[PDB]
Design a protein around this ligand. Structure first.
Ligand code: MG
Ligand code: ZN
Ligand code: ZN
Ligand code: ZN
Ligand code: ZN
Ligand code: ZN
Lengths: 92, 556, 115, 46, 484, 82, 117, 260, 67
RNA sequence: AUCGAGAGGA
């Protein structure tokens, strides 16, 4: 709450580099379990990450201890086995 | 670029002549549901306290107390006496009250007049009440239409809406330097009948009409006739309705073209040539061409001379006073208005038969190879063109005969000369002849093998076969004419239902092309990138709502 | 859902007075009478009887909104007269006329039945 | 306490309870309607 | 008639004849009286609008538990009828009332396709109707983990309990026929065993702002063999301001105002019209059939007959109607001398009056009014919901933002698109420009990318923009928010 | 830019008037001192309108020219068109 | 007309043809609107059609172009080329939930300390 | 400056309607009397229905509304009864309401017509008009074998300004100047218009010659009664009610003047 | 469905004239003659009787739900 | 509650 209130006067685009994605991704080691949850409790490395955000109401995100509203989505990553063509940047 | 918005409502709209043009009637339920956040001050502390004690149950109350710390008190259920108390830093979301500024909107929103600011007037029943003159900018009516009412939640938003988007300020469009609002059906017919030379109002009638004049000094004008009985004319009352000292010279819809040439130019035998001097209607009968949306009309001159508030009171006074006079005069429509005379019927028949004989002559000439084609057209092209010319001449002549047959008491003619509704073509189709039914710009096609319908013979280019509705609406159409008219109406519906997508795409493309173009503080017109497009807006540097048509005296 | 109660048109709300006297500033010897829960039934007769008075310069009535249930009557009288007195005299004369009409109607009814 | 329903075919006033099959004893119909309430509901002729 | 020998022979070799020209019409087009005197778009509008007319949709409506059903109180067969309606069976099941219609300008509340209904007639039953709504509910035993049961919920056991009153049910979880149920009221008590203990309330409430009465309820078993309930709730809808009505010639309008009998105009005899329509509706639409139907209705009411409005029939014309009307002591053109109800003075222009068949369209304002003030919001984006049924707000779309742009109301545009729609804030790293992991409780702001804890700023922006930027990030685009 | 010269129009615009009235109304509603003698007024909109008509508004308009510079105008230094 | 005479000649031709279309039926539109549209269609030295192929090819801003048309395509172009948005437009600030530099937002307000006396 | 001196003249007086002419009065007074005829004459009508049972084809609203439309004898008990608003008792009492009771079961094969005769009241003087000792009884509902109606009703006091069921008139015919002497109505073609019932003209003439110094006098009336009151009672009660309203207005005006 | 108690326009009773009107119709009376016999002078009440369809008789064919 | 479809109103 102590972050000063500022307005964005410039929006610079770009391609998210793999190193930046790996560094900023909240999950460590990437997603390797394809299932959502086991026995109700969310899987620590699966898609229903406890670190990527909050699941249901009256719950707090592991990374930032935020509720349904005050918790922005935290970003994850997946370490691909081999490089993959990007269809949007295919002509590029 | 578009999303669902809180603090909005939608209901069917309903006419209300008793509301000002800037006023909208809101059902009490909508006002009870909506709220506005008012900051507590020592000025309004007592009223805000009364509202919170009243609560969400009674309509003039509130359901939320917003403390400065942030927590909200919900007064809907079990209001605790301890937290009912409020301080200066607090704000309370009170229910919508009369005089609140709301922006009214009708979809589709085409121009900027499609959204105007209105003042709330709480009314018993459950519809959005809107003044009849504010309809035209909204392109509204009351056959099930609905409008959206957005309620600004902040003081700056309310102030900016009040200072920019108020209905009085939206009278004149920069699109065509003309008023977007004017006088509508009932008041227009009533003012046409009211401003006639032979309208005389008694003492009680004049006083009753004056009870409905907001900008009245309280002095009864000297009657235009003192003996043998005091009488006031309609032009006198409308002169006192007219605001300020605006001057205007207009023309009525029945003004002859030779009146300004020969004598009696300044003394009109037909009471045309509307002249307003020092705010006084000296002479003339008013209509659409003097109280409508045309440039240079009375309402336009009023807006240019006086202010938007004065023009708003002008509109309201016109509507209310002449509605209350219509309460005495009356206006109807019925069968008797659709009947011509026996001689007129005879004239119609003559015009028809002669036209049928002429078309038969063309058909015979074509069958005898005696029709030399006109240059630039094929023989069937020339044949059809002249057949349609004969039929159109017959229809125009029979319409003129119907117009001549129309009397001064005819309600069709009344609503047409007033400009309220209808037209010469509508009168002609009702009385004399509906006319030729055309599909894709040509006559009815041969849907069958060289036949329009199986009731005709092959290769029959007569008017009846190709869709010339010989009868009128009053007489009734023969079944083949009924089918052909159904085809014409279907074509009209097809065009109406088809053109909308293309028009909307065109509008969206234009706005997305020009949306960032703005007039800068160096009086230049620049886009978002700051690339200049016009050193001076419109090459002169003027807005579109302040210019007017003029005449250059040294050119001709 | 927002249908007003049927009796709202004549039943006086608590704390709301039936009549109210306000003075017109634009012209002298003029006053505005605002009567709640009344309509044309009383407005027209009061206006006509005020129009009878030779010392009433102006007499007019209006209903500001058919949804509302109040009438406004404007009376302007001679400098030696008062709009309040004009209203009172008009009401008294209407009362007398109604009493006379009722008595005469009862007499005519009795005569018609008795033959 | 009986909570009598009314059959849709033979209109027999039969009593049912919870955890019991929805059937009519007289005719075996599977459709029945609930009896009108006994509360004093008030209507204003208007 | 086309087979008779004439002075000029047109065809003289006919091979077939039509039984009757009116057979070219359909079912909703044969109801139109005098369709050959109308403009074709009006005929099409009436053909579409008759399906919306309100009457007795079926004789056995007491047993049909339809979701929606409007039934008129006092349907009447038209005084002016077409011969096809006999086979259409519209006489047996009519969908309107013959109304005394005065085409006049009165107080200005009938302007622009609006009607003035006689209030006293409405109090007598004029166009009164009943609205039927049915609610379905079944208990599903698909799995032992969660099973539903019809029972009366109590606050000491159920979790999902609202503020509504649950005392209106019996011990079977069902409401009884003949109970006044208002908005947000419980009619089906259903509790599902939990996996505020061991049962979650799943009751079915009444529709918003209804205040109806439970007509009848039906308990049965469905195909799967479980209990099935259907509840019909009855509401009476008196005609009021904002209700849509139409003639049989494409003349639709809403109820502008309702004047009492003493306020309406009246003839020499005490005939106050039930409906007043504006004269301006006719010349633009050229519905001469409307006026002819009114004239024939007056004639038929005076003569004690049902008029013949077969489309193509030379036997009956307007003039004959006039003659017949004049034979009954009325003006041949149907005009009457009306007296102002407020003042009692004669109206200078004689007013057209007569019986005209009218319909009450299913368009009741009570189902169109809706207002929103901070209600529920969606889950994908924190924007207001959709549809009055879900208490959703109105859409301030692209054209609305366009007009506000032309206005120049920047603060109002911001209030509509950001403040009143989806206010949201997010912390952004000043260097990378990516949303930062910031904890409000402990005020420890971090950015795993740049590994900084000081150059973090707070920016306020709509949740939709946050979702769009996160979607672009998931699409490998890096939209960097630079506030320097 | 020297204060001795300015190139913008001396007339307040409708947008400037609307925003000045709204901002001053919010300030008044947030307990700010008033620059006019309030006869009986109690609503911020008309209080701000009275202050504007009195030319006693404590607000400075920063008119940003496209070149990047700005000219500061007091509300009392601008002709009120309406 | 453009290719034979020039950008100014095509500006005049566009104005006259659009006026023909508008006023063929008798309706009237103020000349400034037509002139502004024609200059917008012409100021960049070539006939910029009012479509995606004309509007999006101007360097107005990737967010403006994504609002208009070809949202994904223009966003990928901006990402691959490292474009930046000056936020000088109106739709960009609307997208970001900020005061658009339009009308009331075209200036800034400062508190007059001296006048507060 | 004073009041008129009106005169009445009754041409026809039956048990259903009254015909009378009022002379030497103003149009405002005549129209006000007509309006009071329609809307400001208190009569007794049912306004409280408690349906114990109803197996008929018409729903409870339908039944209640039809019962409320049934007129009742209000000739003399209407004055003694007071509005429930002003009554100091509970919801109902003998001095502010009239009790009613309906109990019909159809057990025969023939369709049973529940008419107004089945309405039984505690007050002997307040009965349905068709039950008074010709015209048949008003049909409330039809019942077949099994269907049964059980209800209780209360009849209150009100005027037509509240609901049309308290309106005691079956039509108030009003007319002045049968020959258009004052030119209040302008006939585009006078010969097309039939002469009024009270017209005094020859067949060769359509309307009376214009009278420039004339005002509406000789107002004609035809007050048809719905049976709640005799027409003479209707006219008398309306005149008394208009007088009473003017009197209350006078009292309020005097109080307001004294307050100033 | 059933005959209204009162005429909509003027409020005169017409709910006690349906059976008599049907009897007159079965007694070979013309519809207008029957209307005159029942004293329906105004065309509003004449409409109220002449345009009435009686659906209560059709509804009475179906058996009652409760016996 | 989500998606999709259909019917509609201006
Ligand atoms: Mg519409
Ligand atoms: Zn989180
Ligand atoms: Zn059974
Ligand atoms: Zn960072
Ligand atoms: Zn009592
Ligand atoms: Zn009647």
């Amino acid at each position: 709450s102590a972050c000063p209130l500022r307005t964005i006067k410039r929006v610079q685009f770009g391609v998210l580099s793999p190193d930046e994605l790996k560094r900023m991704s909240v999950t460590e080691g990437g997603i390797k379990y394809p299932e959502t949850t086991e026995g109700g409790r969310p899987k620590l490395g699966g898609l229903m990450d406890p670190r990527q955000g909050v699941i249901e109401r009256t719950g707090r995100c592991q990374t930032c201890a935020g509720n349904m509203t005050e918790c922005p989505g935290h970003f994850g990553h997946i370490e691909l086995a081999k490089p993959v063509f990007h269809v949007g940047f295919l002509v590029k | 670029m578009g999303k669902r918005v809180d603090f909005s409502a939608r209901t069917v709209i309903t006419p209300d002549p008793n509301l000002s043009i800037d006023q909208v009637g809101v059902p009490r339920s909508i006002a009870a549901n909506m709220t506005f956040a008012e900051i507590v001050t020592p000025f309004n502390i007592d009223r805000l306290q009364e509202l919170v004690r009243r609560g969400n149950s009674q309509y003039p109350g509130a359901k939320y107390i917003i403390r400065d710390n942030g927590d909200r008190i919900d007064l809907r259920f079990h209001p605790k006496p301890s937290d009912l108390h409020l301080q200066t830093g607090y704000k309370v979301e009170r229910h919508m009250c009369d005089g609140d500024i709301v922006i009214f909107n009708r979809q589709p929103t085409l121009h900027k007049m499609s959204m105007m600011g209105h003042r709330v007037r709480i009314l018993p029943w459950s519809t959005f009440r809107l003044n009849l003159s504010v309809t035209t900018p909204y392109n509204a009516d009351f056959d099930g239409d609905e409008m959206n009412l957005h309620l600004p939640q902040s003081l700056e938003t309310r102030a900016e809406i009040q200072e920019l988007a108020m209905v009085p300020r939206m009278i004149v469009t920069p699109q065509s330097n003309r008023p977007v609002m004017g006088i509508v059906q009932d008041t227009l017919t009533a003012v046409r009948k009211f401003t006639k030379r032979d309208v005389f109002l008694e003492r009680g009638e004049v006083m009753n009409l004056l009870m409905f004049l907001s900008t009245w000094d309280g002095k009864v004008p000297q009657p235009a006739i003192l003996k043998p009985r005091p009488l006031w004319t309609g032009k006198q009352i409308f002169s006192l309705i007219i605001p300020g000292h605006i001057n205007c010279i207009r023309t009525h819809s029945t003004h002859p073209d030779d009146e300004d040439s020969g004598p009696y130019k300044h003394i009109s035998p037909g009471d045309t040539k509307v002249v307003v001097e020092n705010g006084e209607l000296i002479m003339g009968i008013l209509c659409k061409k003097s109280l409508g949306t045309s440039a240079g009309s009375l309402v336009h001159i009023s807006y240019l001379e006086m202010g938007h508030d004065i023009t708003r009171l002008f509109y309201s006074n016109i509507q209310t006073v002449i509605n209350n006079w219509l309460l005495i005069e009356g206006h109807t429509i019925g069968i008797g208005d659709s009947i011509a005379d026996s001689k007129t019927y005879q004239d119609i028949q003559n015009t028809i038969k002669k036209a049928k004989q002429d078309v038969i002559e063309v058909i015979e000439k074509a069958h005898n190879n005696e029709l030399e084609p006109t240059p630039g057209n094929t023989l069937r092209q020339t044949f059809e063109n002249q057949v349609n010319r004969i039929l159109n001449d017959a229809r125009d002549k029979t319409g003129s005969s119907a117009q001549k047959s129309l009397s001064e008491y005819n309600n069709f003619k009344s609503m047409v000369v007033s400009g309220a509704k209808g037209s010469k073509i509508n009168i002609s189709q009702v009385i004399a002849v509906v006319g030729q039914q055309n599909v894709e710009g040509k006559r009815i096609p041969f849907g069958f093998k060289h036949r329009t319908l199986p009731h005709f013979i092959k290769d029959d280019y007569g008017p009846e076969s190709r869709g010339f509705v010989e009868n009128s609406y009053l007489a009734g159409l023969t079944p083949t004419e009924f089918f052909f008219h159904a085809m014409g109406g279907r074509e009209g519906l097809i065009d109406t239902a088809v053109k909308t997508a293309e028009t909307g795409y065109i509008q969206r493309r234009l706005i997305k092309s020009m949306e960032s173009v703005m007039v800068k503080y160096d009086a230049t017109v620049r886009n978002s990138i700051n690339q200049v497009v016009q050193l001076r807006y419109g090459e002169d540097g003027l807005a579109g709502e302040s210019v007017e048509f003029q005449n250059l005296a040294t050119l001709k | 859902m927002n249908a007003p109660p049927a009796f709202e048109s004549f039943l006086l709300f608590e704390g709301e007075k039936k009549i109210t006297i306000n003075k017109d500033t634009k012209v002298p010897n003029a006053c505005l009478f605002t009567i709640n829960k009344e309509d044309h039934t009383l407005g027209n007769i009061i206006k006509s009887q005020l129009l009878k008075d030779p010392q009433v310069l102006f007499a007019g009535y209006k209903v500001p909104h058919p949804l509302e249930h109040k009438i406004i009557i404007r009376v302007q009288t001679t400098p030696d007269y008062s709009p309040q007195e004009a209203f009172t005299n008009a009401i008294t004369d209407l009362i007398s006329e109604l009493s006379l009409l009722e008595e005469r109607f009862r007499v005519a009814i009795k005569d018609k039945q008795e033959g | 306490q009986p909570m009598i329903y009314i059959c849709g075919e033979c209109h027999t006033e039969n009593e049912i309870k919870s955890r019991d099959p929805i059937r009519c004893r007289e005719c075996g119909y599977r459709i029945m309607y609930k009896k009108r309430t006994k509360r004093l509901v008030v209507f204003d002729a208007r | 008639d086309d087979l008779q020998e004439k002075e000029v022979a047109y065809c003289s070799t006919y091979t077939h004849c039509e039984i009757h020209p009116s057979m070219i019409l359909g079912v909703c087009a044969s109801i139109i009286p005098f369709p050959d005197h109308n403009q074709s778009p009006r005929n099409t509008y009436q053909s579409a609008m008759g399906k919306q007319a309100m009457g007795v949709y079926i004789t056995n409506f007491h047993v049909r538990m339809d979701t929606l059903a409007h039934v008129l109180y006092y349907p009447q067969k038209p005084l002016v009828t077409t011969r096809s309606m006999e086979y259409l069976r519209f006489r047996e099941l009519p969908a309107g009332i013959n109304s005394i219609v005065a085409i006049a300008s009165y107080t200005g509340y009938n302007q622009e396709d609006s009607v003035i209904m006689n209030r006293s007639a409405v109090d007598r039953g004029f166009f009164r109707s009943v609205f039927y709504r049915s609610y379905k509910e079944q208990e599903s035993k698909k799995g032992f983990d969660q099973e539903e049961v019809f029972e009366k919920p109590t606050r000491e056991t159920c979790q999902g309990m609202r503020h509504a009153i649950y005392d209106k049910l019996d011990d079977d979880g069902l409401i009884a026929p003949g109970v006044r149920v208002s908005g947000d009221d419980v009619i089906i008590g259903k509790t599902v065993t939990l996996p505020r203990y061991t049962k979650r309330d799943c009751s079915t409430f009444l529709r918003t702002s209804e205040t109806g009465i439970v007509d009848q309820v039906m308990v049965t078993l469905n195909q799967e063999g479980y209990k099935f309930c259907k509840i019909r709730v009855r509401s009476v809808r008196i005609p009021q301001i904002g209700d849509k009505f139409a003639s049989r010639h494409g003349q639709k309008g809403t109820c502008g105002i309702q004047y009492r009998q003493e306020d309406m105009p009246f003839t020499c005899e005490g005939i106050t019209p039930d409906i007043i329509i504006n004269p301006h509706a006719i010349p633009s639409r050229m519905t001469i059939g409307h006026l002819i139907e009114c004239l024939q209705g007056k004639v038929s009411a005076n003569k004690g007959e049902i008029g013949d409005a077969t489309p193509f029939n030379d036997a009956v014309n307007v003039q004959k109607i006039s003659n017949l009307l004049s034979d009954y002591g009325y003006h041949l053109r149907g005009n009457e001398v009306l007296y102002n109800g407020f003042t009692g003075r004669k109206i200078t222009s004689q007013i057209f009056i007569g019986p005209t068949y009218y319909q009450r369209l299913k368009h009741m304002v009570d189902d169109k009014i809706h207002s929103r003030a901070r209600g529920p919001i969606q889950i994908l984006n924190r924007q207001p919901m959709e549809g009055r049924s879900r208490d959703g707000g109105l859409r301030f779309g692209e054209m609305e933002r366009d007009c506000q742009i032309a206005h120049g109301a920047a603060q109002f545009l911001r209030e509509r698109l950001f403040e009143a729609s989806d206010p949201y804030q997010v912390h952004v790293c000043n260097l990378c420009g990516i949303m930062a992991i910031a904890n409000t409780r402990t005020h420890t702001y971090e950015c795993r990318g740049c590994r900084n804890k000081t150059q973090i700023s707070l920016v306020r922006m709509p949740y939709a923009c946050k979702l769009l930027f996160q979607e672009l990030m998931s699409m490998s685009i890096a939209p960097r928010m630079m506030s320097v | 830019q020297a204060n001795q010269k300015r190139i913008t129009t001396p007339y307040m615009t409708k947008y400037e008037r609307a925003r000045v009235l709204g901002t001053r109304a919010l300030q008044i509603a947030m307990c700010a001192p008033v620059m006019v003698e309030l006869e009986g007024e109690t609503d911020p909109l008309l209080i701000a309108m009275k202050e504007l008509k009195a030319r006693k508004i404590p607000i400075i308009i920063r008119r940003y020219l496209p070149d990047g510079s700005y000219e500061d105008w007091g509300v009392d230094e601008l002709i009120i068109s309406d | 007309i453009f290719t034979v005479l020039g950008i100014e000649a095509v500006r005049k031709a566009l104005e006259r043809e659009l006026y023909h279309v508008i006023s063929f039926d008798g309706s009237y539109v103020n000349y400034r609107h037509l002139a502004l549209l024609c200059d917008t269609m012409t100021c960049r030295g070539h006939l910029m059609a009012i479509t995606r192929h004309g509007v999006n090819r101007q360097d107005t801003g990737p967010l403006m172009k994504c609002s208009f048309e070809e949202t994904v395509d223009v966003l990928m172009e901006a990402a691959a080329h490292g474009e930046s948005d000056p936020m000088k437009g109106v739709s960009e600030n609307i997208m970001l939930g900020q005061l658009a530099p339009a009308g009331t937002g075209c200036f800034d307000l400062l508190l007059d300390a001296e006048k507060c006396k | 400056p004073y009041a008129n001196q009106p005169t009445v003249r009754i041409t026809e007086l039956t048990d259903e309607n009254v015909k009378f002419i009022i002379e030497n009065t103003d149009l405002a007074v005549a129209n006000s009397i007509r309006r009071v005829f329609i809307a400001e004459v208190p009569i007794i009508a049912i306004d409280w229905v408690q349906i114990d049972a109803n197996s008929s084809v018409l729903h409870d609203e339908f039944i209640a509304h039809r019962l409320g439309l049934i007129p009742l004898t209000s000739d003399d008990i209407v004055d003694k009864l007071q509005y429930s608003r002003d009554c100091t008792c509970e919801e109902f009492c003998p001095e502010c309401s009239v009790e009613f009771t309906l109990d019909v079961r159809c057990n025969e094969d023939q369709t049973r017509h529940v008419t107004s005769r089945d309405l039984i009241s505690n007050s002997p003087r307040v009965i349905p008009v068709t039950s008074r000792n010709e015209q048949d009884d008003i049909l409330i509902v039809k019942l077949r074998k099994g269907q049964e109606l059980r209800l209780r009703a209360y009849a209150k006091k009100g005027f037509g300004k509240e609901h049309a069921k308290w309106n005691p008139t079956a039509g108030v015919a009003f007319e002045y100047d049968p020959d258009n002497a004052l030119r209040h109505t302008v006939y585009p073609k006078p010969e097309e218009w039939p002469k009024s019932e009270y017209s005094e003209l020859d067949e060769d003439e359509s309307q009376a010659p214009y009278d420039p110094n004339g005002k509406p006098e000789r107002f004609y009336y035809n007050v048809e009664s719905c049976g709640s009151l005799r027409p003479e009672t209707i006219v008398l009660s309306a005149l008394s009610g208009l007088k009473k309203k003017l009197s209350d207005l006078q009292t309020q005006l005097s109080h307001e003047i004294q307050s100033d | 469905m059933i005959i209204p108690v009162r005429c909509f326009t003027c409020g005169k009773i017409v709910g006690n004239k349906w059976e008599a009107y049907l009897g007159l119709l079965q007694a070979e009376y013309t519809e207008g003659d029957a209307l005159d016999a029942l004293g329906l002078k105004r065309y509003c009440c004449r409409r109220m009787l002449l345009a009435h369809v009686d659906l209560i008789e059709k509804l009475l064919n179906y058996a009652p739900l409760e016996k």
